[PDB]
Amino acid sequence: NSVSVDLPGSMKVLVSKSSNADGKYDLIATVDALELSGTSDKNNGSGVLEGVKADASKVKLTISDDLGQTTLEVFKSDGSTLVSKKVTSKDKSSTEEKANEKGEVSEKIITRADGTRLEYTGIKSDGSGKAKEVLKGYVLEGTLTAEKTTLVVKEGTVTLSKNISKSGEVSVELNDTDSSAATKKTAAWNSGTSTLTITVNSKKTKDLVFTSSNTITVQQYDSNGTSLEGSAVEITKLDEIKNALK
């Protein structure tokens, strides 16, 4: 006599139709063939479920009270040395951490709701590591520090850096080492409009807009640098980013 409850990431928990004499509900879930079980003082599917793998690893699924988030933890048999931790939100955005043998997080994947990802590897005790952003049509490479993630695209003497704060806030900057003052690119970032405006030789040349969909559009200025012209074009591949940096 159970009730099925939908969870983040198209998972399920089974909750007893009625409570026991203590007013508690029974919970059962199966995560990749491993049965987890628990009890809860709520009737909605929220609560904690536990199980133990064949290799003695301890597994705990915690379902938030409003069903908006699940946390799936795997530990070694001590129940404290982390193996992995996955936090899934209702829109199927998620974070997944993987630990080293000492239980320290060394790998992390942030999956956005739109399917784009930020992936970290080799995270060190100072918070540094390597980073990759996986977009629709291209991959960006860079680094992680305790402060921010920085993805870098280099083209000639120009470096475009896409910085991502711990809160996920994107800002972008550009630097050019071009020794010719006349062809050197500079740029300004407008956080309010998520736009990087590139200038060469005192004339704005283009706006790169970093959209809420984790895409980039490019639109050129006229020959005077004082009006935008034509229509903005979505970038779909790395070579088009580099073209904009030429």
**Element of type H or E holding 114:** none
* Cβ within 8 Å of residue 31, ≥6 positions away: 11, 59, 61, 72
Give 53's strand partners. Answer: none
Q: Are the beta carbons of 38 and 27 closer than 8 angstroms? A: yes
Coil, strand or helix at 8: helix
Task: Identify the experimental approach.
Answer: X-ray
Preceding-residue numbers of gaps in the chain (C–N over 2.5 Å):
none
> Phi and psi dihedrals of 113, rounded to 5?
-60, -30
Looking up tokens 């580099």 gives 242
Residue 53 structure tokens: 């793998």
Q: How far from chain centre, in Å, is Cα 208? A: 22
Host H or E run for residue 245: helix 238-245
Domain ranges of the chain: 1-100, 101-246
Helix (H, G, I), strand (E, B) or coil at 10: helix
Q: For domain 1-100, is the CATH number 3.40.30.10?
A: no
- Residue in this structure with the two tokens 């006599």, named with its chain if needed: 1
Residue 124 has a CB neighbour count (10 Å cut-off) of 12
CA distance 182 to 189: 21
DSSP 8-state class, residue 221: B
**Resolution limit in angstroms?**
1.2
Query: 238: part of which helix (H) or strand (E)?
Result: helix 238-245
State residue 240 phi and psi, 5-degree precision: -70, -35
- List of residues 6+ apart from 32 with CB closer than 8 A: none
CATH of 101-246, one of 3.30.70.250, 1.10.150.20, 3.90.79.10, 3.90.930.1: 3.90.930.1
Closest CA to 98 of 85, 87, 110: 85
From CA 116, how far away is CA 170, in angstroms rounded? 14
Provide the 8-state DSSP code for 17. Answer: S
Cα separation of the two ends of the chain = 66
**Which region, left, alpha or beta, applies to residue 156 given φ > 0 means left and ψ of -120 to 50 means alpha?**
left
